Design an enzyme around this catalytic site. Structure first.
Site, PDB file in Angstrom:
ATOM      1  CG  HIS A   1     -25.828   2.360  -5.602  1.00 35.76           C
ATOM      2  ND1 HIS A   1     -24.511   2.761  -6.041  1.00 35.76           N
ATOM      3  CD2 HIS A   1     -25.761   0.854  -5.325  1.00 35.76           C
ATOM      4  CE1 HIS A   1     -23.361   1.247  -5.532  1.00 35.76           C
ATOM      5  NE2 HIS A   1     -24.689  -0.049  -4.862  1.00 35.76           N
TER       6      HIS A   1
ATOM      7  CG  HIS B   1     -22.792  -0.846  -0.975  1.00 28.67           C
ATOM      8  ND1 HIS B   1     -23.232   0.116  -0.566  1.00 28.67           N
ATOM      9  CD2 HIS B   1     -23.064  -1.679  -1.769  1.00 28.67           C
ATOM     10  CE1 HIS B   1     -23.769   0.156  -2.774  1.00 28.67           C
ATOM     11  NE2 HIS B   1     -23.577  -1.000  -2.555  1.00 28.67           N
TER      12      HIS B   1
ATOM     13  CG  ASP C   1     -25.926  -3.602  -3.635  1.00 28.72           C
ATOM     14  OD1 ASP C   1     -25.762  -1.920  -4.272  1.00 28.72           O
ATOM     15  OD2 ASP C   1     -24.780  -3.472  -3.799  1.00 28.72           O
TER      16      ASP C   1
ATOM     17  CG  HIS D   1     -26.466  -7.985 -10.567  1.00 26.82           C
ATOM     18  ND1 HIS D   1     -25.098  -7.840  -9.730  1.00 26.82           N
ATOM     19  CD2 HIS D   1     -26.593  -8.483 -11.178  1.00 26.82           C
ATOM     20  CE1 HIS D   1     -24.429  -8.549 -10.741  1.00 26.82           C
ATOM     21  NE2 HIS D   1     -24.722  -8.991 -11.431  1.00 26.82           N
TER      22      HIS D   1
HETATM   23  O1  99I Z   1     -17.593  -4.204  -8.118  1.00 27.74           O
HETATM   24  C1  99I Z   1     -17.298  -3.870  -7.220  1.00 27.74           C
HETATM   25  N1  99I Z   1     -16.855  -4.150  -5.643  1.00 27.74           N
HETATM   26  C2  99I Z   1     -18.281  -5.256  -5.868  1.00 27.74           C
HETATM   27  C3  99I Z   1     -18.803  -5.231  -3.806  1.00 27.74           C
HETATM   28  C4  99I Z   1     -19.872  -3.785  -3.517  1.00 27.74           C
HETATM   29  C5  99I Z   1     -21.091  -5.042  -3.756  1.00 27.74           C
HETATM   30  N2  99I Z   1     -21.516  -4.708  -4.490  1.00 27.74           N
HETATM   31  C6  99I Z   1     -22.344  -3.464  -5.595  1.00 27.74           C
HETATM   32  O2  99I Z   1     -22.281  -2.428  -4.413  1.00 27.74           O
HETATM   33  C7  99I Z   1     -23.101  -3.323  -6.488  1.00 27.74           C
HETATM   34  C8  99I Z   1     -21.744  -3.248  -7.740  1.00 27.74           C
HETATM   35  C9  99I Z   1     -21.380  -2.285  -7.453  1.00 27.74           C
HETATM   36  F1  99I Z   1     -20.463  -1.812  -6.905  1.00 27.74           F
HETATM   37  C10 99I Z   1     -22.981  -1.281  -7.260  1.00 27.74           C
HETATM   38  N3  99I Z   1     -23.888  -2.172  -6.470  1.00 27.74           N
HETATM   39  C11 99I Z   1     -21.092  -6.493  -3.080  1.00 27.74           C
HETATM   40  N4  99I Z   1     -18.934  -6.862  -4.078  1.00 27.74           N
HETATM   41  C12 99I Z   1     -18.306  -7.874  -3.815  1.00 27.74           C
HETATM   42  O3  99I Z   1     -19.218  -8.893  -3.848  1.00 27.74           O
HETATM   43  C13 99I Z   1     -17.368  -7.664  -4.043  1.00 27.74           C
HETATM   44  C14 99I Z   1     -16.531  -8.995  -3.671  1.00 27.74           C
HETATM   45  C15 99I Z   1     -16.777  -9.238  -5.041  1.00 27.74           C
HETATM   46  C16 99I Z   1     -16.439  -2.003  -7.203  1.00 27.74           C
HETATM   47  C17 99I Z   1     -16.104  -1.863  -6.497  1.00 27.74           C
HETATM   48  C18 99I Z   1     -15.522  -0.582  -6.549  1.00 27.74           C
HETATM   49  C19 99I Z   1     -14.763  -0.402  -7.680  1.00 27.74           C
HETATM   50  C20 99I Z   1     -14.191   0.461  -8.163  1.00 27.74           C
HETATM   51  C21 99I Z   1     -12.837   0.892  -7.875  1.00 27.74           C
HETATM   52  C22 99I Z   1     -11.561   1.375  -7.853  1.00 27.74           C
HETATM   53  C23 99I Z   1     -10.872   2.081  -9.292  1.00 27.74           C
HETATM   54  C24 99I Z   1      -9.643   2.518  -9.596  1.00 27.74           C
HETATM   55  C25 99I Z   1      -9.185   3.153  -8.440  1.00 27.74           C
HETATM   56  C26 99I Z   1      -8.147   4.061  -8.571  1.00 27.74           C
HETATM   57  N5  99I Z   1      -6.917   3.651  -7.307  1.00 27.74           N
HETATM   58  C27 99I Z   1      -5.934   4.608  -6.722  1.00 27.74           C
HETATM   59  C28 99I Z   1      -5.305   3.638  -6.120  1.00 27.74           C
HETATM   60  O4  99I Z   1      -4.136   2.534  -6.285  1.00 27.74           O
HETATM   61  C29 99I Z   1      -5.439   1.509  -7.306  1.00 27.74           C
HETATM   62  C30 99I Z   1      -6.066   2.064  -8.362  1.00 27.74           C
HETATM   63  C31 99I Z   1     -10.089   3.658  -7.440  1.00 27.74           C
HETATM   64  C32 99I Z   1     -11.066   2.894  -7.083  1.00 27.74           C
HETATM   65  C33 99I Z   1     -14.038  -1.536  -8.731  1.00 27.74           C
HETATM   66  F2  99I Z   1     -13.492  -1.638 -10.015  1.00 27.74           F
HETATM   67  C34 99I Z   1     -15.142  -3.268  -8.373  1.00 27.74           C
HETATM   68 ZN    ZN Z   2     -24.089  -1.038  -4.616  1.00 27.67          ZN
END
Ligand code: 99I
Ligand code: ZN
EC number: 3.5.1.108
Length: 297
Positions: free
Chosen positions: A78, A235, A239, A262
Site C-alpha cells: 500500500h 483495491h 495492490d 502478490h
Molecule cells: O488478508 C486480508 N484480505 C485479503 C483480501 C484483500 C486483498 N489483498 C490485499 O489487500 C493485500 C493483502 C493485505 F490485506 C494487504 N494487501 C485480496 N484479498 C483476498 O483475496 C481475500 C479473499 C482472500 C485481510 C484483510 C483484513 C483482515 C482483517 C481484520 C479484522 C480482524 C478482526 C476484526 C475484529 N472483528 C470485530 C467483529 O467481530 C469479528 C472480529 C476486524 C477486522 C484480515 F484478517 C485479512
Molecule cells: Zn492491499
C-alpha cells in the site's frame, strides 16, 4: 525533461501492523538520485536496509514481504502503491518494527501525508521500464499479463461467488486519470471466515473495521459501508501498482490481472526481468511528447 522525484520534507506517521498488531513509527526521508525506495528497520542495531526490489521479495502468503537474511518488512504494497502513484523515485522508509502500518487499509493516508510534505524534482532523468512484448503468467484459473501500451494502465477482474459481489472488473488509464482520485482510498477487505481462521493462527492481530472492509456471508459490517461501488477491485489495482513498483522504476505498459494477488504479481515481475527481449529502460528529454505526465510537485 521528466525528472526524478524525492520528498521535499520528512513525513512521520504512527500506526499498527495488520498482521502483527504491533505499534510502528514510520519515517519517510528524501533520498539522492538513483537511490530507489529503500526500507530501513531502525529498531535493529545495526540498522537493516532492504531495497524495495523484486529480488528482495520473501515467500509469504499474507502480503508483499521484503527480506534480507531472517529480517523482514511485511505489507509494503500500500505504501509502495502511494510512492508509485505520486511518481516518487527516491526515498528512505524507516520503520520501528517488522510491519508497515495499515492506517485506514488504503493508500489515502500515505498520499495525503506525502502531498502535505510536498515533492522535490531532482536534476536527473526519470527512468521508465517500457514493455516491448506481452509477458504472461498463469497458475490455475489465475492470470497476470504485461501488454505493450503507450502510457500506463491497469485492468483487473476478480470473481467471488458471494452476495456482496457490485462490479468485479475495472480499467484505469493513469496517463489521463489520478491514482489519487480513482484508487488511493480503496481499502483492503477480509471475509469473516478467513478473519476467524487467521485470528486462530495469531494473524490479523491489528485488523479492525477502522483499517479493513469486513464482509460476512451477506454484507459489509463496516457501519459507513463502501467508499466506491467497485472498492474491492479498485483495491486489487492499488495492490498491483504497489507490487509493480518492485521493478524499481515507473512502467510504460499495461497490466491485466485476473484473480491475481502478490504471489502471481511477483512471478510476473521475475519472468519480465528475466526476459530482456520484452522490456527496456527509457528516459524522456521532452515531457510534452512523453506518454505519461505527473502532478505538479
Ligand atoms: O488478508 C486480508 N484480505 C485479503 C483480501 C484483500 C486483498 N489483498 C490485499 O489487500 C493485500 C493483502 C493485505 F490485506 C494487504 N494487501 C485480496 N484479498 C483476498 O483475496 C481475500 C479473499 C482472500 C485481510 C484483510 C483484513 C483482515 C482483517 C481484520 C479484522 C480482524 C478482526 C476484526 C475484529 N472483528 C470485530 C467483529 O467481530 C469479528 C472480529 C476486524 C477486522 C484480515 F484478517 C485479512
Ligand atoms: Zn492491499
Amino acid at each position: 525533461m521528466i525528472k526524478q522525484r524525492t520528498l521535499k520534507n520528512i513525513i512521520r506517521a504512527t500506526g499498527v501492523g495488520l498482521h502483527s498488531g504491533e505499534k510502528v513509527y514510520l519515517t519517510l526521508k528524501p533520498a539522492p538520485v538513483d537511490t530507489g525506495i529503500v526500507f530501513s528497520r531502525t529498531d535493529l542495531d545495526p540498522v537493516v536496509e532492504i531495497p524495495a526490489r523484486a529480488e528482495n521479495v520473501g515467500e509469504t502468503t499474507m502480503s508483499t514481504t521484503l527480506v534480507k537474511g531472517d529480517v523482514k518488512v511485511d505489507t509494503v504494497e500500500h505504501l509502495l502503491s502511494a510512492m508509485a502513484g505520486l511518481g516518487i523515485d527516491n526515498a528512505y522508509v524507516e520503520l520501528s518494527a517488522s510491519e508497515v502500518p495499515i492506517m485506514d487499509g488504503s493508500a489515502g493516508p500515505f498520499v495525503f501525508l506525502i502531498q502535505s510534505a510536498g515533492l522535490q524534482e531532482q536534476e536527473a532523468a526519470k527512468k521508465f521500464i517500457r514493455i516491448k512484448r506481452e509477458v504472461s503468467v498463469e497458475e490455475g484459473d489465475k492470470r497476470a499479463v504485461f501488454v505493450p501500451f503507450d502510457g500506463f494502465k491497469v485492468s483487473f477482474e476478480i470473481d467471488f461467488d458471494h452476495p456482496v459481489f457490485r462490479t468485479q472488473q475495472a480499467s484505469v488509464d493513469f496517463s489521463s486519470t489520478s491514482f489519487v482520485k480513482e484508487v488511493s482510498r480503496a481499502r483492503t477487505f477480509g471475509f469473516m471466515r478467513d478473519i476467524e481462521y487467521l485470528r486462530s493462527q495469531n494473524l490479523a492481530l491489528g485488523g479492525s473495521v477502522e483499517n479493513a472492509i469486513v464482509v460476512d456471508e451477506n454484507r459489509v459490517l463496516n457501519e459507513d459501508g463502501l467508499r466506491y461501488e467497485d472498492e474491492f477491485v479498485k483495491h486489487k489495482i492499488l495492490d498491483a501498482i504497489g507490487d509493480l513498483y518492485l521493478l524499481g522504476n515507473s512502467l510504460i505498459g499495461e497490466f491485466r490481472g485476473f484473480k491475481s494477488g502478490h504471489a502471481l504479481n511477483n512471478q510476473l515481475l521475475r519472468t519480465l526481468i528475466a526476459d530482456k527481449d520484452a522490456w527496456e529502460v527509457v528516459t524522456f528529454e521532452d515531457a510534452r511528447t512523453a506518454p505519461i505526465s505527473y502532478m505538479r510537485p
